[PDB]
Amino acid sequence: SGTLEFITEGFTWTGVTQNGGSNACKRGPGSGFFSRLNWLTKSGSTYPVLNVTMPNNDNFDKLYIWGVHHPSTNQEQTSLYVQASGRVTVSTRRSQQTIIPNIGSRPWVRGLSSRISIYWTIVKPGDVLVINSNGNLIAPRGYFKMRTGKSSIMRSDAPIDT
Amino acid sequence: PNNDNFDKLYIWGVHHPSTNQEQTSLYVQASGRVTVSTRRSQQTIIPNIGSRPW
Ligand SMILES: *[C@@H]1O[C@H](CO[C@H]2O[C@@H](C)[C@@H](O)[C@@H](O)[C@@H]2O)[C@@H](O[C@@H]2O[C@H](CO)[C@@H](O[C@@H]3O[C@H](CO[C@H]4O[C@H](CO)[C@@H](O)[C@H](O)[C@@H]4O)[C@@H](O)[C@H](O[C@H]4O[C@H](CO)[C@@H](O)[C@H](O)[C@@H]4O)[C@@H]3O)[C@H](O)[C@H]2NC(C)=O)[C@H](O)[C@H]1NC(C)=O
Ligand SMILES: *[C@@H]1O[C@H](CO)[C@@H](O[C@@H]2O[C@H](CO)[C@@H](O[C@@H]3O[C@H](CO)[C@@H](O)[C@H](O[C@H]4O[C@H](CO)[C@@H](O)[C@H](O)[C@@H]4O)[C@@H]3O)[C@H](O)[C@H]2NC(C)=O)[C@H](O)[C@H]1NC(C)=O
Numbered sequence: 043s044g045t046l047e048f049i050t051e052g053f054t055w056t057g058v059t060q061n062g063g064s065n066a067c068k069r070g071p072g073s074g075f076f077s078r079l080n081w082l083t084k085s086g087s088t089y090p091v092l093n094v095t096m097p098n099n100d101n102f103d104k105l106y107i108w109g110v111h112h113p114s115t116n117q118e119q120t121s122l123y124v125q126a127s128g129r130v131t132v133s134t135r136r137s138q139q140t141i142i143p144n145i146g147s148r149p150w151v152r153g154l155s156s157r158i159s160i161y162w163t164i165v166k167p168g169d170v171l172v173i174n175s176n177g178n179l180i181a182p183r184g185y186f187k188m189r190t191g192k193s194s195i196m197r198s199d200a201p202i203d204t
Numbered sequence: 205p206n207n208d209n210f211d212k213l214y215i216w217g218v219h220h221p222s223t224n225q226e227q228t229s230l231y232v233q234a235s236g237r238v239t240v241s242t243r244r245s246q247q248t249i250i251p252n253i254g255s256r257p258w
């Protein structure tokens with residue numbers, strides 16, 4: 043693609059807290075999170091079933107980056123999302139993905155046994171993005187513009203010069 | 205059984221209802237299952253209820 047250009051969209055998440063950060067990702071002195079990801083926790087006693095739709099009406103492809111949260115315990119899972127088994131379903135006209143989070147521990151890193159699985163979805167012009175979840179969703183704040191062209195990546199330690 | 209001297213290609217499918225009421229209205233039990241196996245392999249698909257865009 044050769045670009046990180048991010049377009050922030052208007053996703054409206056109701057009955058659910060946004061912006062939730064952690065100690066393992068820090069911005070400034072306080073807690074923080076992935077800048078392009080929105081971590082949603084419950085509000086009150088309830089985390090509602092979320093059904094939302096984001097149409098792509100533009101003439102270019104959209105790349106949405108999202109995630110799924112894996113708690114290291116049932117007490118964390120339920121403490122955050124209410125229902126003890128979460129679900130995330132991301133579908134367009136041409137495809138769908140359904141991920142059901144893995145509770146339990148995988149070996150510690152950065153002080154946490156809980157992780158995130160990252161997934162991407164491409165939305166073509168005239169197609170809509172649809173997002174549906176009962177819990178365990180790290181939502182997109184928008185998309186990345188997709189370009190076609192000569193850009194690439196290379197692994198090197200060589201210094202750069204003028 | 206395939207008793208012939210040539211390979212057979214079987215095409216089949218799984219039905220995804222847009223509702224539990226359609227699923228149960230059609231198939232009785234609210235969670236369906238399909239398992240297709242030969243000696244050398246197997247596939248097991250459990251249908252996705254719910255809506256994908258019209
Ligand atoms: C990453 O880049 C995004 C896209 O912009 C650009 O990309 C970069 C790399 C460069 O190439 C730039 O030259 C290029 O423009 C940034 O998104 C931008 O964010 C700003 C600030 O929030 C948005 O400004 C607002 O635009 C509103 C509508 O604009 C219309 O036209 C644009 C431009 O083509 C379209 O994208 C839109 O869809 C609209 O059709 C406008 O109404 C707003 O005015 C109101 O708000 C201001 C306060 O911000 C207020 O003063 C005023 O009274 C109004 O109430 C506002 O101007 C801008 O739309 C948006 N650009 C795009 C292309 O989406 C993004 O910020 C950047 N990321 C970071 C973190 O820097
Ligand atoms: C299945 O087995 C695995 C391995 O035994 C287990 O996961 C492991 O959990 C332990 C802790 O229970 C992890 O060890 C950590 O190491 C860090 C780094 O130094 C420590 O800081 C951690 O200890 C903290 O908490 C302790 C208890 O209060 C304090 O004594 C300590 O000072 C710290 O505050 C912690 O011990 C270990 O890293 C993982 N295993 C792996 C391979 O990473 C898991 O819990 C077991 N699951 C079940 C179902 O029992």
Ligand SMILES: *[C@@H]1O[C@H](CO)[C@@H](O[C@@H]2O[C@H](CO)[C@@H](O[C@@H]3O[C@H](CO)[C@@H](O)[C@H](O[C@H]4O[C@H](CO)[C@@H](O)[C@H](O)[C@@H]4O)[C@@H]3O)[C@H](O)[C@H]2NC(C)=O)[C@H](O)[C@H]1NC(C)=O
Pocket residue numbers: 093094095170172255256257258
């Ligand atoms: C999660 O959200 C999605 C999107 O909101 C939703 O799926 C959508 O269902 C609507 C209808 O409920 C679909 O829109 C259809 O568009 C056709 C084509 O023109 C209409 O003909 C359909 O309307 C018929 O039925 C209506 C109700 O009686 C009548 O008013 C109308 O005249 C027609 O008879 C229908 O509105 C839409 O296409 C999908 N979404 C997408 C992206 O395709 C889904 O139901 C939501 N799920 C949950 C759990 O709530």
